[PDB]
């Protein structure tokens with residue numbers, strides 16, 4: 082019916098969110114799931130920091146909503162419509178380039194459509210599986226080893242390394258395959274703005 086999670090709040094603020102849910106017969110989870118409907122985010126007056134849940138929130142085209150949505154509904158003895166209340170960036174996108182918009186409204190076409198992503202070698206900040214499940218969420222196709230791209234002329238393939246996580250071999254990925262090596266940052270920024278971005282700024286020196 083309606084399931085909720087929330088990001089970058091203090092307990093003081095959590096309190097309300099609880100008592101907001103409680104009031105309007107809503108369920109609550111600490112852990113973003115496939116079955117969630119809403120992500121609630123701290124802001125500024127509508128700009129959020131960049132949480133893991135931020136991404137999978139958009140990833141989903143769920144309701145990605147700033148906190149004010151709720152303190153304003155407590156105030157006004159009633160729930161407000163969500164459609165007047167979603168977030169509009171962080172740092173990738175300023176107040177400028179609202180993402181969750183497209184996300185929610187798109188879906189019938191995803192932003193990874195017919196691609197193949199391999200999240201290659203060490204991660205940390207945001208660890209492999211979620212990363213994959215992320216792109217997997219917006220219709221990318223997930224490979225485990227470079228040695229599994231079904232090039233089959235048709236589909237386009239990508240490697241994504243997180244660069245720093247490994248302590249200097251990731252120049253020599255081109256030494257195994259004929260997809261490009263974009264950097265994690267490609268995914269993230271692409272999923273924030275929910276366009277599919279330009280590998281240009283994100284490619285990694287591939288060394289014969």
Ligand SMILES: [Co+2]
Nearest residue numbers: 235236237238
């Ligand atoms: Co092409």
